[PDB]
Amino acid sequence: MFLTRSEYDRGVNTFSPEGRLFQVEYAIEAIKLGSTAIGIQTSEGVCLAVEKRITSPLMEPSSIEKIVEIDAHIGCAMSGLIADAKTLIDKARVETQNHWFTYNETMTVESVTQAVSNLALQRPFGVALLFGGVDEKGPQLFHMDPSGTFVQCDARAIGSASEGAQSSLQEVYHKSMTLKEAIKSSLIILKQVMEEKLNATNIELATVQPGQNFHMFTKEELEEVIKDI
Amino acid sequence: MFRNQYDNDVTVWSPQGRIHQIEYAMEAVKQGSATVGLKSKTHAVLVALKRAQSELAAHQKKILHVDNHIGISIAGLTADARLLCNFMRQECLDSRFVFDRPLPVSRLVSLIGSKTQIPTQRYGRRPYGVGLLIAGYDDMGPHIFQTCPSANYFDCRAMSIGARSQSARTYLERHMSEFMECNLNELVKHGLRALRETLPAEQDLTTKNVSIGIVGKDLEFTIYDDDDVSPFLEGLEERP
Amino acid sequence: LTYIFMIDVSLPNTTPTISPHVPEFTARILEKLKPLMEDERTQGIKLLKTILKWLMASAGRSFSTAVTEQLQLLPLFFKIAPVENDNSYDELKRDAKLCLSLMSQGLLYPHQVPLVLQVLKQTARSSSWHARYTVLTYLQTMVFYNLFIFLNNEDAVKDIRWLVISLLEDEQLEVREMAATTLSGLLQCNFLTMDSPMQIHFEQLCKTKLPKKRKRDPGSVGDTIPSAELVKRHAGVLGLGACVLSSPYDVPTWMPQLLMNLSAHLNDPQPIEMTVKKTLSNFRRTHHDNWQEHKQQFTDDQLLVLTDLLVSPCYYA
Amino acid sequence: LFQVEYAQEAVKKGSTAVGVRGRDIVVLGVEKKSVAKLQDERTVRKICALDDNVCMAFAGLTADARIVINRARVECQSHRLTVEDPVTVEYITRYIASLKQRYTQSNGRRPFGISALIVGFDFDGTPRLYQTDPSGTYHAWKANAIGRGAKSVREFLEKNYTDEAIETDDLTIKLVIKALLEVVQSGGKNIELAVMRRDQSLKILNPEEIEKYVAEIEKEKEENE
Amino acid sequence: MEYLIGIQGPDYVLVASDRVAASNIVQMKDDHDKMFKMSEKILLLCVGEAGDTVQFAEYIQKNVQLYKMRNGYELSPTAAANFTRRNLADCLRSRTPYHVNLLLAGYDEHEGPALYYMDYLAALAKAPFAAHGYGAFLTLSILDRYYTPTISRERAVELLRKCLEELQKRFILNLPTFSVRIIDKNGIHDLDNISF
Amino acid sequence: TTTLAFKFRHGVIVAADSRATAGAYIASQTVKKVIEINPYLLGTMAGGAADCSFWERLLARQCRIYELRNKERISVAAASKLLANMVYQYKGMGLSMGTMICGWDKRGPGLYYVDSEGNRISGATFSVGSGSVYAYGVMDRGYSYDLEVEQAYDLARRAIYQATYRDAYSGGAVNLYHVREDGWIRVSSDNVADLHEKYSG
Numbered sequence A: 001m002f003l004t005r006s007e008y009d010r011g012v013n014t015f016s017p018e019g020r021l022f023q024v025e026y027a028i029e030a031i032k033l034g035s036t037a038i039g040i041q042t043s044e045g046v047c048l049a050v051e052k053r054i055t056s057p058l059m060e061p062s063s064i065e066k067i068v069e070i071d072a073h074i075g076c077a078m079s080g081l082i083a084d085a086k087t088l089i090d091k092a093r094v095e096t097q098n099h100w101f102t103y104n105e106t107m108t109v110e111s112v113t114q115a116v117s118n119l120a121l122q123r124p125f126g127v128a129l130l131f132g133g134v135d136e137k138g139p140q141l142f143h144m145d146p147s148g149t150f151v152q153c154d155a156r157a158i159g160s161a162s163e164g165a166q167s168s169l170q171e172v173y174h175k176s177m178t179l180k181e182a183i184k185s186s187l188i189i190l191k192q193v194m195e196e197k198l199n200a201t202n203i204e205l206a207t208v209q210p211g212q213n214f215h216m217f218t219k220e221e222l223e224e225v226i227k228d229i
Numbered sequence B: 001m002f003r004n005q006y007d008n009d010v011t012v013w014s015p016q017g018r019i020h021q022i023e024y025a026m027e028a029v030k031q032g033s034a035t036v037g038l039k040s041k042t043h044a045v046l047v048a049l050k051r052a053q054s055e056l057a058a059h060q061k062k063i064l065h066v067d068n069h070i071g072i073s074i075a076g077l078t079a080d081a082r083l084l085c086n087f088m089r090q091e092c093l094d095s096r097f098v099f100d101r102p103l104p105v106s107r108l109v110s111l112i113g114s115k116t117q118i119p120t121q122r123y124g125r126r127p128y129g130v131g132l133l134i135a136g137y138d139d140m141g142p143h144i145f146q147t148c149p150s151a152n153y154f155d156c157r158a159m160s161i162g163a164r165s166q167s168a169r170t171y172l173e174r175h176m177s178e179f180m181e182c183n184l185n186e187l188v189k190h191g192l193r194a195l196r197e198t199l200p201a202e203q204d205l206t207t208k209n210v211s212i213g214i215v216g217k218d219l220e221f222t223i224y225d226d227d228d229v230s231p232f233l234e235g236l237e238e239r240p
Numbered sequence C: 001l002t003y004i005f006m007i008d009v010s011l012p013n014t015t016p017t018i019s020p021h022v023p024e025f026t027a028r029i030l031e032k033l034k035p036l037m038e039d040e041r042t043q044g045i046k047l048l049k050t051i052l053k054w055l056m057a058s059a060g061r062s063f064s065t066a067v068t069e070q071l072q073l074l075p076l077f078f079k080i081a082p083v084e085n086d087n088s089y090d091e092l093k094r095d096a097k098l099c100l101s102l103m104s105q106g107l108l109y110p111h112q113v114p115l116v117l118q119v120l121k122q123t124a125r126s127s128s129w130h131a132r133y134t135v136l137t138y139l140q141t142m143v144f145y146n147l148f149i150f151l152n153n154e155d156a157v158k159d160i161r162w163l164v165i166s167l168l169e170d171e172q173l174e175v176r177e178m179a180a181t182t183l184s185g186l187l188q189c190n191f192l193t194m195d196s197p198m199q200i201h202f203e204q205l206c207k208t209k210l211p212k213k214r215k216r217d218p219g220s221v222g223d224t225i226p227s228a229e230l231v232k233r234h235a236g237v238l239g240l241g242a243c244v245l246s247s248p249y250d251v252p253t254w255m256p257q258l259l260m261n262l263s264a265h266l267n268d269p270q271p272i273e274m275t276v277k278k279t280l281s282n283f284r285r286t287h288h289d290n291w292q293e294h295k296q297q298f299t300d301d302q303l304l305v306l307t308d309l310l311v312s313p314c315y316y317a
Numbered sequence D: 001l002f003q004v005e006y007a008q009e010a011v012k013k014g015s016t017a018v019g020v021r022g023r024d025i026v027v028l029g030v031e032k033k034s035v036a037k038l039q040d041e042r043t044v045r046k047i048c049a050l051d052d053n054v055c056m057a058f059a060g061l062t063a064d065a066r067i068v069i070n071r072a073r074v075e076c077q078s079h080r081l082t083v084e085d086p087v088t089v090e091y092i093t094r095y096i097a098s099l100k101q102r103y104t105q106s107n108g109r110r111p112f113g114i115s116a117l118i119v120g121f122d123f124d125g126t127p128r129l130y131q132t133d134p135s136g137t138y139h140a141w142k143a144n145a146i147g148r149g150a151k152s153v154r155e156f157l158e159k160n161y162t163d164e165a166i167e168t169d170d171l172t173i174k175l176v177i178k179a180l181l182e183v184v185q186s187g188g189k190n191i192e193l194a195v196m197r198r199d200q201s202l203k204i205l206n207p208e209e210i211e212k213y214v215a216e217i218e219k220e221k222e223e224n225e
Numbered sequence E: 001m002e003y004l005i006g007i008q009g010p011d012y013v014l015v016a017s018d019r020v021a022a023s024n025i026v027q028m029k030d031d032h033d034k035m036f037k038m039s040e041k042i043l044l045l046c047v048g049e050a051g052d053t054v055q056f057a058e059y060i061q062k063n064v065q066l067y068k069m070r071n072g073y074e075l076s077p078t079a080a081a082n083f084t085r086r087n088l089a090d091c092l093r094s095r096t097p098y099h100v101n102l103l104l105a106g107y108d109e110h111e112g113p114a115l116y117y118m119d120y121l122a123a124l125a126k127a128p129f130a131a132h133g134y135g136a137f138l139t140l141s142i143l144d145r146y147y148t149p150t151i152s153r154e155r156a157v158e159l160l161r162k163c164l165e166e167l168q169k170r171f172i173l174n175l176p177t178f179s180v181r182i183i184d185k186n187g188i189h190d191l192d193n194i195s196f
Numbered sequence F: 001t002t003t004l005a006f007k008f009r010h011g012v013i014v015a016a017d018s019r020a021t022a023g024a025y026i027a028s029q030t031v032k033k034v035i036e037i038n039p040y041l042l043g044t045m046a047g048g049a050a051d052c053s054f055w056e057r058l059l060a061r062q063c064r065i066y067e068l069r070n071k072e073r074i075s076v077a078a079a080s081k082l083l084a085n086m087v088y089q090y091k092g093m094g095l096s097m098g099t100m101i102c103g104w105d106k107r108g109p110g111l112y113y114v115d116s117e118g119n120r121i122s123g124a125t126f127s128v129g130s131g132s133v134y135a136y137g138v139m140d141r142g143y144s145y146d147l148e149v150e151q152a153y154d155l156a157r158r159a160i161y162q163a164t165y166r167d168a169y170s171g172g173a174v175n176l177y178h179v180r181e182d183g184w185i186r187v188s189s190d191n192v193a194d195l196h197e198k199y200s201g
């Protein structure tokens, strides 16, 4: 409400007397104000759900994609402008193929998230990314912060209402959750933040399963899932 | 209202002959979670308490591998620690390629001190915000070292860095005489007890929140996490 | 439309105009907008867009703002408006946020203040979380401007205090945090005065035992809603945190005790852990400038507990 | 942030540009503003051919547009040299959006300041229409408008756009003219229209040709009355 | 080895090229086109070292196409030939030298038909007629004996056929089919391939 | 090395021998001379084994990045040009690579020959390697666009076998792949010794 400014805030590369870097903290918070994205990781599969928020009927819905395929086994959900994450998504895609050429093998999600973090370190970066894929360990989900910290999350929500979604996610999530149950829960949580009827344009749903590659649900496939709710 | 003209840059010297930005960076280590490192005649052990964003989140990794004989625990900005860790790994690999000899830990800590010093003396550079506890085994023996954002480094019989570190340091100083002759199991127990002092009374050490790394005459640096920490944790007595 | 209704005025010693009156026109629009308040709804949405443009234009031109019928249109705007502003909100939502801000910064007659509060209380009870969050945002501007008029009505001060405290215990985290932000600002401007009853209510809510049981482990359950006990604990810590944030640059005599209480709740499960970390971190940054004067209020033992606190963000360690 | 908003103000003041994607024809129409009594209109264009299969209409600062158009044209030839295939409309839009994201200098008005409607046909023969923003966000639209009156034109397009409207090449041209006619009032005097066609070079209709289409829409309106 | 020929008449430029692409002893392709359409009224015929011909010719084509997009008007055939000569000459002393022998045929509304001969050494000469390849030695004389400045387009096709017929009878190499194109005010027009 | 590819009514047929020879030593008889760039594209390897393997693998990496970046598969023409451009940069530096890029794309069935020299050509029938001359004749005499799939498979097997009989540096087994609109399918791997008994019998 009322302004609460301190001399050491907004100092760029200057440590505050406490030792915190305030300008970096403010930048990271602004980055996390994008559209809500929910990822839940289950033994059966990892599911990523995002809100498209298309402005006009004329616009083609496919052109706005918040879920992208880094590789057959890895997919990324982003909150905020696609343009901000374009360089980071490209780095991950180039690294996954560069790794394949050098070692003739798939790159684990943790190694892929570390490479994107290294680019972010080499500077806030302006995006929060959820990387979900099935690797040698199994189905795995990682969260990348605008700061560049990466942690494995059983269930994570990034975006404007992430804090509320995360509390809802905590109560619903259980280790034995099936992929079909996870899809329903993430969409139910997404509906609560959106406060809008779920439709194919409103939400984009993608899943990576151990046998299957990255799959983005088609309009008909999403419609069946939303109707069951 | 009480603005200081001399705290804007690391280059500026205060009229009291102090560089404020270096002191502010030194405080950054205290922001990080507590980490305890102690050494015996044959082994050096780093024990750290990790913290997690949520119950679902895995927990941040305080301890990292630098070489077969060298391991480090980070307190303070993680990004700075990753830059330092990458530098340390390159120096160690270079020493094996050129001399086929594990790089002496003392020489590595000196190189980190040189790298950290340059940001302190140059414009538009923030001093590193990470404090590192380094555990290594060399011909001289097991060694524990502490690095500071100031670029000073210290050889320590035992050291604790991070929030509530002083409580651990009081335990480490009290029982330091026992540490030199302690067996690996007892030395790890002493480190867990010092870390326990940092913890608030309600909270207690758990397999999820504790990371242990040990280097020794016949042991390459090994990081024990989750179930691996359970044998060490079971032996510890209940909180006094 | 603003020009057509300009002649109608509430100015003293004025006869009713022969020109068109705003109250009659709004009543016809309100009846037409009743279905939204499928074809009928779509026709209404187009009408809402035109009327919203009229209210935005009439905010400064109209001699008397806040006509009672115009106040009745506010609940529909609250649900449509977005919690966070964006350029992809489809125009009607973006316009609704702009209209609410212009209406909130409007002079209110003393007679209008009871009526506006009643509409605000009703929308606060509404199911939509966006409407409950928006009511708190509308209240913050509406109270700061026209501050003395609201203060003159004691009943308004009591009702505004109750609405903010009631919204503090709401299920949505975003609304709960906005309620704390409103309370901290209201305490700062002295519209709401920290009192022994207010602190006792927060302390009682803070001391609520967590359930300590998991519905998910047995399974066959879908508890999307957060546990009530966790919401009660968060409301108490959010209330104590708002009191700490009320004085950013000064430590009052009550401040040290509240800080000691906030420190105890640091290890509590999220979202309580995040709230305590942010309040303490903000207190440290604002109170660093005059710390030597601020330190005197704290006893030596109290200072030690505050110094040994980890409120660092995830990027640290 | 402030720079992006300043760029958005420049595009809003720009001449209206409307584009429609049709089954065999993609149409780009831009309003032509009056210049000066002694000025020559040949220099002012606002519709440019990036390549044989791609055409661009811009609303925003003229100087910034020249730099973006030149860089895009050099990229189209470079893509053809490297891959031997005509540039996809999406690829050229992605390049222009990236160029808008970085002016190549820290600060220095990094957003280019031009919003572009890029229309053309892919090697496959799929008609495509895309919109570029100073922010660097690029979207695909069946029909869209940029510049003065864009929001009002879009609503007319949303109601008017239909399978029947895009059924024939003449009808798609007429739809572009009708939408432009709302924002810009005149006959063929103030409107410039370009028809890409399919597997054919971009054609800018002559003033006489645009007037004939304008005359037909007026006759249809009289019949509708 | 590869054969190129051009005849410039009063209102037209007639160009023919062998259509055979060959490896060391075997003809990989018999449908090869050695003519690159730089512009609506300009054709570049390029023969020479493998790789160098495709890369250099494509680079010149893209730059001429770029000039049309940037300025909206096509380069003159004389300007296009001079741009090619400068680029080839700069590469001559560079680490990467292109061994390309080229014929440029074009029609300019202002200057009419133009035929240009450029060797690997980048020397540009305007010619009424010119040829490249080993077969050029055998066919240049036939063109010299019967060429007239006012030759008709039909007679020019007949003269070209006589040179192609000579290659079949005396040339050691097998060049069965030839690609024939004519450039005029109307534009480049493909003509039926002469086959033997 | 003998590798042959022809375009017929039912698709593109790619065939190869399996012999890698250092000097006159037969180092390998099981080498796979066709690389699968993508489920619809194949690349043939002739000339130095390392040169072809590294460059074709690099093309495969570029093709996957193109598919990920543009959300559409690379054309046979685009892949052929990309290999030609990369090898050309190192022209005159001793790389020896003769390759046929065979695949099905939006345009239709596609065959291109790319060489270390820098030749890139498209044709219905191509044969590359030391035994190319022997394969070319048998393939040319029995090749027709209207050939049925079974007849086409036999022509490819016969052309590799006759080439192996005459050429010292060709031998091993005939690896057969058929590119189809659905995608490439591995068809049969037949030892020339087994083929010799069938043909001679």
Ligand SMILES: CC(C)C[C@@H](C=O)NC(=O)[C@H](CC(C)C)NC(=O)[C@H](CC(C)C)NC(=O)OCc1ccccc1
Pocket: F001, F019, F020, F021, F022, F023, F027, F028, F031, F032, F033, F045, F046, F047, F048, F049, F050, F052, F053, F129, F169
């Ligand atoms: C994988 C295919 C591309 C190989 C294929 C292509 O011709 N068949 C071949 O026969 C090629 C052709 C070569 C004789 C020029 N053979 C080869 O490339 C063989 C590879 C073997 C040593 C494993 N020769 C070679 O690469 O030389 C490497 C070498 C260098 C020094 C000593 C011994 C061997």
